[PDB]
């Protein structure tokens, strides 16, 4: 068994991170977090909860494997070359990092160590309609991927939001931040793990008090043989039913796949949505009972030494063309 | 009442473009074609119609007012231009033209001559979702346009394909020939008239067998204040109920339209749906009974010299768009 921490709860992600282990076998064994309403939250969450007042003293314990976390963007990368230093794996929520550089240092380090670095990039692995689509197009059912388009629409809920939100230096960007999903969503289904970028953008428009937000991006991207599309906002109505009404549409040569993440709108109740248009026609796949395989292909992966969850390469890759398209961008 | 005449029935869009102006009660005085099982078929669907067996008699007419046209897209340009010089108003169906040389003389006549150059961007005009698109856009209902994704697979056929088709010269590119559709869609929303193309790209990833045709393409378009995405396919799968499934989404400060053109997946009867993400709530519209008012526009344009069915300048600036991407695809 497993046994994990949560270090830095700065974002709401956190949460899925820890059930997406827990589900999966792993057992919880504190956590630490300055902030006494995120750790409030966190413990009236879990439990057990036993809260340690120093980081390094979760990073100096012999029994713990794994470090989560999804501390400020721009503070992950030095927490886990710390965690992997001290022996540690590490699960952080996307974005990773928020520049080269940083990129770069963990790349060394986890060359240094080989200790596991993943991104839970949870709009794929959190969703099953998209976990669907990949089991489908590997299976033949759409012949080449010749076009992915990823659009994804965010809630601001600004006066939510913390300070570090809009702080262009602490979260990265709109493309590094929000558009990482798609980035590696792109790379994993193309199946290649190098790509390039044509072209990006980024802007602010609807919120004109918040000058260091960026309110919409897009990015243009190929790898040779397949061409991409990925649009992002902070722009989600607010009589949408969910936070955002995420699209994925995978153009091929026998068949056209559209995954809607998490509504329908005006159709049917929930998310996640397929449908497969074929040689034969046009099916309405419900995929809410697909099982999520991340947990179980991480937790082997720290067991077994491997990569069944992610190719480590690609975890990178995604970063990169992220950064790269937010670079380019301005 | 107009007259009017028909030169060149290479494409069927020639039906559309007729039956649009009759529809719109100009009348159909006669027509040209060389071809005599093109001849045949126009016969039979327009039982009036005044077979002319020289394109010179119909241009030396002086009591005809317009030149409807369709033929082989890069002999498009040279009857256009005739065509105005000899006192006459032309519309054409997309492409208007298959050069930047092309659309220099295009633009340089028609300011000589004083008459109208006017595109049946059908994908447009003779959608009447996207024309209710405009109108709730003009409201107010979602602010400030922000991004624009239009999405264009179409179906193959050939079958059905004449040969000029699949000649390079001929078509234009896939960029020139069915994104041209996108590209004034993008000037209509965005309200604007200079936009540039950031990037683009084109392919045949499907069809070995005419090496010179384009399977896929895409685009990057901006305009400082508003982005825009383009995707367009010959590769509209065969179970698909129709030709294809466009969509166009409209991105907003305060709200989110979807139009689904031609078919729901396994939804809703028919196209053209028009969903709407709001402050209020999401609805889905149904625009089958809204008019198409292009036609009224476009007639009283020639009576008046005025420009309301689109402004000459944008007629010319989605070509010019399409062509850039075209040529920067290379």
């Given at each position: 068994e497993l046994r994990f921490a949560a270090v830095?709860?700065?974002?709401?992600?956190?949460?899925?991170?820890?059930?997406?282990?827990?589900?999966?076998?792993?057992?919880?064994?504190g956590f630490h977090e300055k902030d006494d309403a995120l750790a409030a939250e966190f413990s009236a969450v879990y439990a057990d909860a036993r809260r340690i007042a120093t980081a390094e003293e979760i990073?100096?314990?012999?029994?713990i494997g794994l470090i989560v976390s999804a501390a400020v963007s721009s503070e992950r990368a030095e927490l886990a070359i710390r965690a992997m230093q001290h022996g540690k794996d590490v699960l952080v929520d996307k974005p990773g990092m928020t520049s080269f550089d940083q990129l770069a240092k963990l790349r060394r380090v986890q060359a240094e160590t080989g200790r596991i670095f993943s991104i839970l990039y949870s709009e794929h692995f959190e969703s099953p309609a998209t976990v669907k689509a990949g089991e489908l197009v590997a299976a033949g059912a759409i012949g080449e991927v010749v076009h992915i388009v990823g659009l994804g629409p965010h809630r601001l809920r600004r006066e939510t939001r913390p300070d570090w939100f809009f702080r262009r230096a602490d979260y990265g960007g709109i493309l590094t931040?929000?558009?990482?999903?798609?980035?590696?969503?792109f790379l994993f289904f193309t199946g290649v793990?190098?790509?390039?970028?044509?072209?990006?953008?980024?802007?602010?428009?609807?919120?004109?008090?918040?000058?260091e937000l960026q309110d919409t991006g897009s990015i243009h991207l190929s790898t040779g043989r397949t061409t991409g599309m990925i649009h992002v906002n902070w722009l989600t109505p607010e009589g949408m039913p969910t936070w955002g009404d995420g699209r994925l549409f995978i153009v091929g040569t026998?068949?056209?796949?559209?995954?809607?993440?998490?509504?329908?709108l005006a159709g049917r109740e929930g998310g996640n949505h397929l449908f497969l248009a074929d040689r034969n026609g046009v099916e309405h796949i419900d995929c809410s009972r697909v099982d999520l395989p991340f947990?179980?292909?991480?937790?082997?992966?720290?067991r077994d030494r491997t990569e069944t969850a992610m190719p480590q390469e690609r975890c990178?890759?995604?970063?990169?063309?992220?950064?790269?398209?937010?670079?380019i961008a301005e």
């Open positions: 830095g709860l700065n974002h709401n992600h956190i949460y899925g991170q820890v059930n997406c282990l827990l589900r999966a076998g792993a057992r919880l064994a990073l100096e314990d012999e029994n931040d929000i558009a990482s999903h798609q980035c590696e969503q793990n190098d790509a390039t970028v044509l072209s990006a953008s980024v802007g602010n428009q609807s919120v004109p008090d918040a000058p026998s068949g056209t796949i559209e995954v809607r993440k998490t509504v329908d947990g179980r292909q991480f937790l082997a992966d720290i990178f890759k995604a970063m990169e063309l992220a950064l790269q398209a937010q670079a």
